[model samples]
Target chain A: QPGSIWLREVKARQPLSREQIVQAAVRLLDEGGVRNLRMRQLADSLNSAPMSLYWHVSTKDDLLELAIDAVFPDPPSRSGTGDWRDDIKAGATDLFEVLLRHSWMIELMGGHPPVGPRALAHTSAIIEILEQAHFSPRQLDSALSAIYYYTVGAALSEASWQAMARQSAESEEEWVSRLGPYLGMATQSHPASLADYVKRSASSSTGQRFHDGLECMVSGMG
Target chain B: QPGSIWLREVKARQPLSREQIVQAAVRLLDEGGVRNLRMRQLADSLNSAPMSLYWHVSTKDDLLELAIDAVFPDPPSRSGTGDWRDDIKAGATDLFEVLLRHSWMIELMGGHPPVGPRALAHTSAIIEILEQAHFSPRQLDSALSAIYYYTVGAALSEASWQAMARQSAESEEEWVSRLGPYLGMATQSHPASLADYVKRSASSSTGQRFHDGLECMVSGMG
Candidate 1:
């Protein structure tokens, strides 16, 4: 039930429209990433004075909240084929893909419920599908919350790993294996089971891990 | 198997020890948070020249990594009393509490696998417990990964909500209720299920939701 700047009425007649400015902000965000997303830089990108931005979006956080909502996919149709499990798998997978595409979006995800219009739409779609399966209201909340966190958490972990690998000029496999030295030391002090587990599991692909987790949650809920 | 600075041998003998410097960094981090943690300021706090820090730690990132490892509590003892489910619940709950106490640590969790010694100790304990449950190596990975994400995701969500609630000068309940306007509108375009679900679930404590998710995963694995 939180309010977003998107819900607010912008009264001023600016040289650029709200949509125009928000769109420009997304482009700037994509190019420079969040650290470089200065309001002054964003204004320069839009070819308007920085002050004009304040008229439409009152502050940097307001603009960021708007930008975060902008990248969410339009929610999948609620008229899903009757199997709730399949519907959920499709819905959760679709959201995972969207987060991966805009990996930068994950950075903005914490610290509040994203009450933006599109985020609400996405949540609404999930609740609708789960409720149709006759889950108790509590079950619906638990199922959706688990899936939601899993997707965000998995996507962020993968994205961060990939970022580090790129910085180090190594493939993800090679970069992760760099833990070999310390892991070897750990085996001596920790259990042999720990060593074997780390060895066997360290290189599983992120996509595989995601599906493995998704199946467990969906199957368990029933 | 990537290397940590902890494995490196330090050549210079500075007046301040690495332990002293990293401990100071934690105090500074708590006061100013991550953004304001300038190396110069950290040096000022330690009463040493900024360059002196480099003698013990190679870079700011290295120091930050050390500071992160310092906050992790010792992993719960593996004396499980023979119930894998109970053991995992206790272990994961301990970790979740640690993250809550040092909420800033969550910010450092991404970008790389935390290869620090304490992080390995924690993972070693988790791997040991699940391995004893007769999970296949792959299942061990999937189960532990799911739990890890849930703990982190739940903690981060709660922290962010508390932060936002503070900014609004409202209690968490009051701020959440403020979402009433949007939920009403969302029900019209999205679905009424969202409204009912949100209303019923909004007041559920973070601990309750976390346990709900954890139970689903642990049972699903078995």
Candidate 2:
């Protein structure tokens, strides 16, 4: 009877790792958004039966929980060797690089806890850095929280700007030319100062504002 | 011929204000993000046909462009009486309120240029408020862009938080809660291992992070 049961169990499908399933699911999220994720589809993406995936991941949301955590691969561990400016810059830049690589990352995991492990690690690591400066627990939490929101928000705008870059590859001049009709490019139609303001930004792109603004913010906090 | 032509045109459809289309579109967007906003649906909602919508609006994108701008109904107007802090706070707050009301607004128009008169007017007002503060052209541009990006990002996070709240209420706690085995929620061999860090945020379900973060950013910017 033991031999018969062992033989039966041996024929059963093997399980997938929760990490493996979550990684595949995150790839889908990066390419698409929340709308595209479904369990069977994810299972198909992994070349496994949906039930087989269940062995490691109890359900789709469970996998997403894992996936969301996975979004933060590694946080910047402060060496306790740099000025806060250098540390903040390193932390912010590291985050920017990661979020940029994964366009949907910020939009995907924003303001939602019960998220995966990495996400929390990412937050805690930053707070640890601030706490090193002898900030109050309240200040550390509040400031880190601010950086978190600011980073995600900046990334969303950066993503949008990148999309516009694709559409406006012809030239900055061409960007304004195409946008003219939709916004009535005339100074009279738009406020004169506003028109000039638009003209000024006509050539600028990327996250200089994000960086500059963030710099202003960290300084204020210090 | 002119009379018959005139009669056909007049009887064809009554005119609409940019206001009418925008208000209707707002309702549609509130109910469902851009997906449910078809020309037919908007008309149906407004007790008219799709073609009638075109009389005032050129197309679906046009209508969307206007609706998004309309949401910025109170773009920070300049009065020169307020200092930079007051100006920044007032302006950012106004923009944030609209975004909070229409959570999907940021996702809809963050990337898209200000297209309609209302949209142009909205941006014009934001720029005007900043320009009054004795800022250099570069500073003005950077400040406005940062604020814009921050608002969109904040809204996106807030929207995600709200969705999670709804999901948690409607479903089981474990509906999204895995304790993220990857976060060290359990030592069970679930494949993905949960780290000690992930456990910290397993239950945080509020938008306090978002609000506090925004406050930090605003302080930082100052």
Candidate 3:
């Protein structure tokens, strides 16, 4: 059964700081995504024995949770600006930038959310902004989640496409062209709208798409 | 290099059809998740030889992509209701239900999108509805992406928690309680807003949380 390593953590006596180990992990993960990260390699990066690394974190999963939080940006301060959208947008955009830079974080988002100190603090900060904005308690919860999850979705959607394109060594146009005939074999035809959808993805910039959608949700804040 | 299996096509007239093979795959995946799915076990479910099954689909990834589209619901008509929101919600909700019913689908969503015939159809249908609603060409893309990605984020948020709980044999309360202490080891204290956010997750129904967030994005459509 899958369980949170966060629950059964035990610090090792070897004297390696968990913070140092997690920092190395983040660096290694940044070079490539999760697949390339390994305890031995991470220890090597820190100029320590792999055994010494275990003192701080028990397993690879623990390192992932820690690394995720280490990169997590602090949320913008809760404001009495009377308009909540600005602060929320700033916080969300900051997270978005962090995620793209550390694309690997998208993989860990659902598996083991970065529920560490920083992630917790970031969530609390965002919640405070929404709170002072006067959203109902229940709606505030929904709003906070909407911002968090929407930001994640936006990140994952862009990151996945970017990751795939880089690895495939193909342009977006190439991917879309290939997609058409592949489905053609399975179904008679595709909708004109799907063609247009892919066309837009080909030309659109990630930043523009993100803010455009962000404002749509922000403006609709009841 | 990672590539869409949809790009390759080698059909085997051998013992089974791709459709039949994918049906069995979906059943096996639904039982547990991607971890439990196996070619031999899936073949057994169909009362066919494992090798016979490969004739239709080349690899496990292919089966996954097929299974995903197999369960994809046809979107409601391109709704001339003049109110595109209703149809989009209906389409989005339909996807949310499917993703939950087959939580494994969430895992596959990013890795290998369900861009098969059925999945493509679903995307196009929603796009058409939005088009008729009079959104600008550029914003329509953003609007459609928001709806799709937001729905996925909502599904992943709920499904991950549900999947975790059903396996852990602990209530949501138990998980939240443990989370507080785990972070306590790393950070000095917590925030009132952090406490409140988890409280809502603990008490909120999946459906309510999903729709509440959905409407927030839907209403914000500029």
Q: Who wins the lDDT comparison?
A: 3
Q: Which model, 2 or 3, shows the larger DockQ? A: 3
TM-score of chain A of 2: 0.78
Model 2, B1-222: lDDT tens per residue? 357856777664656666888898989888987887888878878777677787776678777777777777565655466556555656776777677778767866646665556566667766776666566777666666656666666677767766766766632235335533434443232222223223334444435555555566566443
* Model 2 TM-score, 2 decimals: 0.79
The fnat scores of all predictions, in order, read: 0.49, 0.58, 0.51
Index of the highest-TM-score prediction: 1
Query: Which candidate number maximizes DockQ?
Result: 1
DockQ list for all candidates: 0.44, 0.36, 0.40
Worst-scoring 10-residue span by lDDT in model 2 chain A: A110-119
- Tens-digit lDDT track of model 3 for B24-50: 788888886888789988887877668
TM-score winner between candidates 2 and 3: 3
Q: Model 1: how far is B4 from its true place, Å?
A: 35
Q: Which window of 10 residues has the lowest lDDT sum in candidate 1 chain A? A: A5-14
